[PDB]
Amino acid sequence: EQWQTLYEAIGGEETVAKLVEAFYRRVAAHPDLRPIFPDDLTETAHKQKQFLTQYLGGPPLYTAEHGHPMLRARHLRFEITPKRAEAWLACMRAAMDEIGLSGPAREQFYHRLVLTAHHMVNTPDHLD
Numbered sequence: 871e872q873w874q875t876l877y878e879a880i881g882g883e884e885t886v887a888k889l890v891e892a893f894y895r896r897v898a899a900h901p902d903l904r905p906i907f908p909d910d911l912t913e914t915a916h917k918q919k920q921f922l923t924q925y926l927g928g929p930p931l932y933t934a935e936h937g938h939p940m941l942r943a944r945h946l947r948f949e950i951t952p953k954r955a956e957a958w959l960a961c962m963r964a965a966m967d968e969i970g971l972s973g974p975a976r977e978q979f980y981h982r983l984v985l986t987a988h989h990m991v992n993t994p995d996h997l998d
């Protein structure tokens with residue numbers, strides 16, 4: 871198959887922008903996520919747009935402004951249980967669906983996010 875970055879494959883900037891906007895609306899509404907995210911998600915969304923751009927092989931926007939992602943380390947500041955990772959991923963799938971992003975490039979991207987989310991998990995789930 872022809873080589874292209876996943877960033878291009880999914881439609882680049884415009885897709886990332888739409889996706890992030892949709893994603894944070896879902897995060898704001900999610901009871902497993904809402905309390906650990908800032909009430910104002912403006913800055914978060916900005917950073918995620920930059921991060922996902924870089925993560926997908928687009929320009930290194932996130933590093934330029936914030937330094938190396940060191941995402942797992944940054945996430946040690948929060949309790950990320952498997953349930954919370956599932957909530958994040960469920961918001962992401964819902965946002966991808968909402969913006970009408972479907973197909974193999976979507977799933978390849980989603981699978982990268984499943985792996986990253988798994989890497990972020992840092993606390994056992996709360997059971998009974």
Ligand code: HEM
Pocket residue numbers: 903906907908913914917918921925936941944945948950954955956958983986987988990991
């Ligand atoms: C697995 C579940 C996850 C949870 C519960 C979670 C939660 C959070 C929270 C609460 C913040 C702080 C936001 C802020 O201060 O503005 C954050 C930051 C961030 N997250 Fe996640 N996150 C998860 C997974 C991911 C994944 C999969 C990615 C990317 C693929 C990601 C990328 C980021 C980035 C780029 C930031 C900004 C770091 C910074 O302040 O520079 N997160 N996350």
